[PDB]
Amino acid sequence: MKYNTGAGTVPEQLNVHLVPHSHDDVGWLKTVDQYYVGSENYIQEACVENVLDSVVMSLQRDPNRKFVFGEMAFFHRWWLEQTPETKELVRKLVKAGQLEFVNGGWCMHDEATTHYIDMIDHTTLGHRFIQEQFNKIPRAGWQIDPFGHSAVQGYLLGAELGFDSVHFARIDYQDREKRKAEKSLEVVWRGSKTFGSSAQIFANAFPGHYGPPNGFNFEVRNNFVPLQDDPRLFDTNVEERVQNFIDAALTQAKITRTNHIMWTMGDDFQYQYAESWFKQMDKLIHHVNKDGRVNALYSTPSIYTEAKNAANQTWPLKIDDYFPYADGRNAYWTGFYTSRSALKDYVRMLSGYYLATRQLGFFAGKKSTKYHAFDLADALGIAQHHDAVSGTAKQHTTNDYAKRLAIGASKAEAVVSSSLACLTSKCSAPASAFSQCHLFNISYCPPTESSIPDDKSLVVVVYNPLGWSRNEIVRIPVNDANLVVKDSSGNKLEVQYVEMDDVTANLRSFYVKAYEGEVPKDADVYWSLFKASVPPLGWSTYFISELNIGPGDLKMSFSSLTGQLKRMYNSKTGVDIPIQQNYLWYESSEGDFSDYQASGAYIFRPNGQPPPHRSSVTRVTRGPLVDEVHQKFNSWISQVTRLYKDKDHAEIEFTIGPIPTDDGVGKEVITRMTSTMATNKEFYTDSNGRDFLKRVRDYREDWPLEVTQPVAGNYYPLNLGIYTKDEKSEFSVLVDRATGGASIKDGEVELMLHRRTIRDDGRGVGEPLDEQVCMEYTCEGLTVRGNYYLSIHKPAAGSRWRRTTGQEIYSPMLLAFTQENMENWKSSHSTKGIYMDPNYSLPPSVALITLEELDDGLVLLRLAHLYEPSEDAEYSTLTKVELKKLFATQKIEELREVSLSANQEKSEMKKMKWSVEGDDFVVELGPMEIRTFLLQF
Amino acid sequence: MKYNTGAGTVPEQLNVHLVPHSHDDVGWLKTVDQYYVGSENYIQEACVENVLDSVVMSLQRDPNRKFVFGEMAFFHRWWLEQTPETKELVRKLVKAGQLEFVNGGWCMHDEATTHYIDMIDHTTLGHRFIQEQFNKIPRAGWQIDPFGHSAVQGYLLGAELGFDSVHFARIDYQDREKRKAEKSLEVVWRGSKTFGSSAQIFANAFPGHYGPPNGFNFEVRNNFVPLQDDPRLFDTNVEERVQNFIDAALTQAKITRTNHIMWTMGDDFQYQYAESWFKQMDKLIHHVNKDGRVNALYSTPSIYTEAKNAANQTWPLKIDDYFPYADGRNAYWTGFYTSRSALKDYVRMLSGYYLATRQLGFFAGKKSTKYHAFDLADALGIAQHHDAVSGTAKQHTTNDYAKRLAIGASKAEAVVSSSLACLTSKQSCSAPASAFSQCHLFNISYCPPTESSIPDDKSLVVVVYNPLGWSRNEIVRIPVNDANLVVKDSSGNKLEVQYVEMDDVTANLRSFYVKAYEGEVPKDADVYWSLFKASVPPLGWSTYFISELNIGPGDLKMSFSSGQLKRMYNSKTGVDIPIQQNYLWYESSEGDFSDYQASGAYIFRPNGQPPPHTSSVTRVTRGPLVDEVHQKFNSWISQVTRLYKDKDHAEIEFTIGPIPTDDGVGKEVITRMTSTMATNKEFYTDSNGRDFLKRVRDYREDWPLEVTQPVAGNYYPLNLGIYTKDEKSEFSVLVDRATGGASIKDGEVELMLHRRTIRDDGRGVGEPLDEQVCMTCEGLTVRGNYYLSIHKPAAGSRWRRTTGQEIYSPMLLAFTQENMENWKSSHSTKGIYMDPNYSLPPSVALITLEELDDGLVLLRLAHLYEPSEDAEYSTLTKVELKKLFATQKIEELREVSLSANQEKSEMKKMKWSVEGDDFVVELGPMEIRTFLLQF
């Protein structure tokens, strides 16, 4: 028989847009490559190679069929294995619109724990491949699975990508009930207070899930009811299946606006045998349309969106974001804002390093390796997946993520070392030219711990990947107490020696072996500190050879008894608050009689009894470069509070772990900073590191909140920081990794820093969050170390500290080490230098977030304005960058402004119109703008 | 990557022949149509449409890939749904050898409980379709799942089909161990004592199962190890999988002759997503061959056999058959020789009816409907499947089989009625199906056309059609309510009649079963049976008009006590044996301390207790047409022993059921005939109704039997009968349906007639054999006949063959009520389609006569006798086709292969080295000859 599969939409009927899809997690229960090749099916039945193999075969059979695919990490692995004939067929299918890419990033990223730079990076990696191979520009965002949604997702990784729509299944369960009653599941979303309706997007929250209606999952070997329409066979059932379809459509139509609804015909790793789905949908389209009561068609989320836009219809407005997400009264998905803190820091650390690596590679003329096997672009792109950096994957998968990142990091280190060798010489240089250290956090740096030969110095090359001037304390572990530090002009520098401590020494013994395989040499005896001063986008070289604290304007007071913070004050600016800082933990709920929901990798459900709260100072240190207060809170919680020279903030280094759980009680550890500030239930948290959103305790803008979790319901994901304010003071906290934050009482701010549960939370990963480090065999709970940064300012002056320090935290100095005689080094190498015009800086409002060599001589460049319109009187203004002065040693031959993911000419982007309820080479940038360019030299 | 998938065989290496396949049962746990469309997957995950869909897609991708498909019932359903473009692609794939048909019958038939006529019929149905669509002749037989194997399967449904080989997984578990040790899994099999090496076949018993080696099942969503050969991905494992492959190959090579082994790369309903399998096989062929230690290739069973034949090798000989089959110590698969007796009888009845239907349709010029939806050809072909007539399907599937047969039977009944109305009319086709009425529930006394009153001036007209090519006299026995009826022949003479009174057992059956079968309660049980002797020419009709203690009317006499049988003797021939007949039942094992195995639909495992025992005469009847003894053995077992006029045998009618199981004891019911004949552990049973094979109690020719089941291991499948003999007597028993039979003690013969168990036997059907009828449910009751006689040595074979054919092909009765003189005025009361006075020789049966498409007529003649059997009839003979078709003129005649897909003269045979080595149709013993005719 011939089936009428070419149906389109019809004006006077309900139209059911059938959208075939396969939700393909880039790692979760299995690793990425296991998901691809289909191995380890006893863990989960899933093979992406089958999905792409069989979808292509099924699309070829009938030109009216469609399918949407998203995750280029999988698509690219598949593409490279395909014959020239299959590639030709795919080009034909894509050109005809049978295979449409939605999202099109390397992965479907989490929106809570990801930084906007990494979001842009992997989205560009996928989009460039799609543009190059198929001359296609994705128009529909696909966020069907991520656990809540960010403002930046709507306007920046939505509107500004050129997407007309974004689609997602998960919103708060109370919000969903209201949105069904209001028919407000579909909205026009304006995620930027700054850009408003100029960066808006059609946002489609599905009624329930991203699967088909009940009885319309057609995966091979499932117990579905086939449509039997052959009269030569027993038990035809055409009428029954058509009525099944109509019934489900009419139910959806009652909670949806216009005469178009969308069915997401697919689920996790479905379409292993695509024809099993396409057979039934062929028959349903045919027989439903013969019946004619409703209308069915093969469709895509962009065809659906075009239909919704063409309807004469006015749409509800959405502002701000969809955080936090809860799918039940005791199930707030705010635990994963912190889950796997060590992986989250690893991602953030490598993201900064990768930004500097790409700068240096460009300046040194190194060629792109973005699509080579195991490149850092692949590993960091994968790491953005909504089970990866979010921390909601199985342990073995998580280990695989870190293995991939380590491989990419090792390749980046060689690029950085070889580029610095060419660039400082007065590119072919071997990676052996410089050594580098990434284990300063546990005091492990062989290049600086090693004895310096006679008539030689330790050469320290310091590279600054910011477009700003920067001074900064260099802090290296050494074994000689009588070292002299000279700058490049021969001046001896003021140094400070800091003694090794026992907490770090025990970390060093355990973790160096865990990471490298064997025990290191003795815990070095000192840290040597000195202040480096480095040009923007450039380097300097240094030669090394044989109760109250605060060396600058900011001061802290501590109890001499329970050595806890009591006060912060700035002498020069005259801000002064009594403030206490302590460590607590919530006990993880394991459920009860009325609700068995446990706390786990996704969900934070505390017991509801007050968080368990004998600290002592074990050291006070004073010196010209740092004042430090070592605090011991218990045997597994220790902290060093550091006030460094010329730093307008305190650096609070935490060390948490092993979290003891032999007592059978999960523990989720917070730092809490308590003041008497009249914060009036308000607190501010960032969106993917950009806009700050005003959060209000126990309040929701879009629905009348029923309070069920007075703590977990007030946690928000941080990637830059959290701040509060009253009439007199602004209290700001910046993080060094994705972190959950909240204000549970007025004047009080807390960060959740580490979590270990005994139970799984029943959302599919099947594992308690029980991170352990092992060795014969000596296993213990994981220990995390990091910094948070706190400061005080007068109203309207904290903004510039948050933006400036946030960028310095993101992009620290890079240190490169070698041992050579100073005289001979100076005679063969430039010791100070700049790739920009000498004496040029980017404006303090701007950051160079992308500088990267692509194929040919194409260079990708992105500049971001860091401030929102009312943040800083001086910096929240129009500014300019002189690209000629950015690129002093070269001459720009062509400049082309492009879309954020660089797959469109900027001037050719067009926007849909919506009716919404309630309605020289100098680059200018206004607040929050990001501009993207392709250059030729 | 490009994979090197085009490998052939290489001479100096072990060759692994990868044969992709999907074992698709034509009904079993789901119905045929559920298996096809993929519904009810909660019962079993299985969709044949996906198999053919995805296999065609995978073969199209790479011309070196191959796949073999068997069951045309499924292929034909799929074919009718395909587009022109898909049909052309299949034609290309078949023409290229990528898709090869193995077996090619409508199904893969059971070999135990099937009749050779039905095996030929469904096989011709599939082979004609394959030949017509693709111009292909299958060369490899495919019996991978049937539960043991028959002699007729080897020589007739193998060699005589033109197959060079036949392949199967199941043989006896003791026999398999010896064959592994002797490397005699593969043999040259000569299943015919008569034809020997002239009808031989290469028989390949697989090492264990028809699946892949462990770790080489690649079905979508299974937990196999994919071969990961991309170095851009983690965890490449090429070397490991190549070694996995080599290891499995070496193990099989240790028990196989030559440098060629075969992997059956598939299983039940596999290849739902074919590419999952072909991806792995592509990679294995490529990397195994790059490795070079062994050689792998896409192959088929016929390519494999060709390599076995080209090898320098002598092969062990196989004679006779592979029955019975056991897969373990207490697991003889001999229960299904009886299981579902009522379905087995239904199949056998409809087979004989369908033979007569095709005769009459040809004579009346009716058009062929063989490939029409729900035709009897489809229903009877499906019924031969190795879970269908064998009785080993689920109950719901079993009901579906019977539903389909009933649809086909209704269609054939209309063909028979319309055809007879045209053919008996004086001016001879337009006649309506309403012209005649017909009755198929005589067994429960239900025949409205004869029970109803006859109007005045009218007679009950009885047309009697005889589908045998022999003259036949037989007793017509119809249920009537009038005691003063007269029966006149066509000349007007009154015939001798005998009235038999209704009995309570049959009346109790009638009320229940008519309502069950027809949906409505019938009128009062009829008061009498009217009996008269009819005499009909061969392939012709006669017309009759109806209006207003020692027994035996003939030579054969039987003695009973005043109620058990005690003696049979024939005064005229001089045979005389004391013989007792009784009913017993084995108690079904439910497992014991040594072995959990239970008796079930497949496996007969009796309890180890001796069979419990049952008795009184309820009626003795004497008359000129029949003497009868009615016997009640218990409340659920009764019998009528009947000695009819001019019948050289007694006809024993059994009625068994409901078998009571509320006591928790399953029961397997036998009739046992006990004599003092010195049978010396020997007894003879037929092969699919044809050759008789000599069975020896507790003895196996091919291996030294370790006796573990002294009863179940001696059961054999019957489709014609069982007999014994000594120096003085020959004792013969003929069945009316597939039945299990045995001789457990010398001079003793038993039939298993009905079985009801409380447990399943753990071979996959998941159901106790617990048949019930409902409206109110009770265990199923079966009624039927077995036939016994006694003869001098060397003259019982004549009775076996003659009576066997008469049982298979009884008269057809057609009724109408009209005035006798009026009927004779517009109808011929006598007729014959052959020449007047022409008869087929007594040794020959017309087993096929049917109109095909266009003017094409298919004819088959069988010589019924083996060389040893009858001095007069085991001889060369001839049929004159000009006299066979008196009414017509032969324009064209071609002799063809048995399944009519090859010209006979063009068939070629492989040569093997075997250890130990006018239109007149002549027929030698056991020959079957097949012709295509045009008129």
Ligand SMILES: *[C@@H]1O[C@H](CO)[C@@H](O[C@@H]2O[C@H](CO)[C@@H](O[C@@H]3O[C@H](CO[C@H]4O[C@H](CO[C@H]5O[C@H](CO)[C@@H](O)[C@H](O)[C@@H]5O[C@H]5O[C@H](CO)[C@@H](O)[C@H](O)[C@@H]5O)[C@@H](O)[C@H](O[C@H]5O[C@H](CO)[C@@H](O)[C@H](O)[C@@H]5O[C@H]5O[C@H](CO)[C@@H](O)[C@H](O)[C@@H]5O)[C@@H]4O)[C@@H](O)[C@H](O[C@H]4O[C@H](CO)[C@@H](O)[C@H](O)[C@@H]4O[C@H]4O[C@H](CO)[C@@H](O)[C@H](O)[C@@H]4O[C@H]4O[C@H](CO)[C@@H](O)[C@H](O)[C@@H]4O)[C@@H]3O)[C@H](O)[C@H]2NC(C)=O)[C@H](O)[C@H]1NC(C)=O
């Ligand atoms: C003696 O001899 C004989 C010979 O002759 C033998 O044998 C027998 O025979 C007979 C005849 O004669 C037969 O009968 C037949 O049968 C068939 C079959 O049956 C079976 O099956 C069925 C079906 O089944 C199915 O279905 C159901 C429902 O659903 C179920 O249940 C089952 O299970 C199955 O299922 C499956 O399949 C399906 C598909 O197919 C699917 O769907 C599903 O899912 C699954 O899978 C059934 O039903 C039945 O049952 C019944 O019966 C029984 C007994 O047998 C009982 O037990 C039961 O209970 C029942 O009964 C009840 O019910 C009913 C009904 O309601 C009532 O009536 C009663 O009363 C009671 O209550 C069985 O099981 C059949 O088919 C047939 O039938 C037919 O025919 C009649 C007359 O003849 C009538 O009545 C009916 O109705 C029918 O009709 C139809 O068809 C025809 C043709 O055939 C035509 O013509 C007509 O027209 C009609 O049609 C049309 O219409 C319809 C209506 O509806 C429709 O359907 C359509 O569409 C068309 O259009 C008959 O019955 C028998 O079988 C035999 N047997 C054996 C065992 O085989 C004997 O045996 C002897 N006896 C001594 C020896 O004793």
Ligand SMILES: *[C@@H]1O[C@H](CO)[C@@H](O[C@@H]2O[C@H](CO)[C@@H](O)[C@H](O)[C@H]2NC(C)=O)[C@H](O)[C@H]1NC(C)=O
């Ligand atoms: C099969 O193999 C046998 C074993 O070698 C071959 O027989 C040998 O071949 C020649 C005779 O043709 C002589 O050199 C040997 O005396 C033979 N030996 C035996 C034991 O026969 C045989 O030629 C091969 N081919 C065939 C068709 O038999």
Ligand SMILES: [Zn+2]
């Ligand atoms: Zn997901």
Ligand SMILES: [Zn+2]
């Ligand atoms: Zn089978």
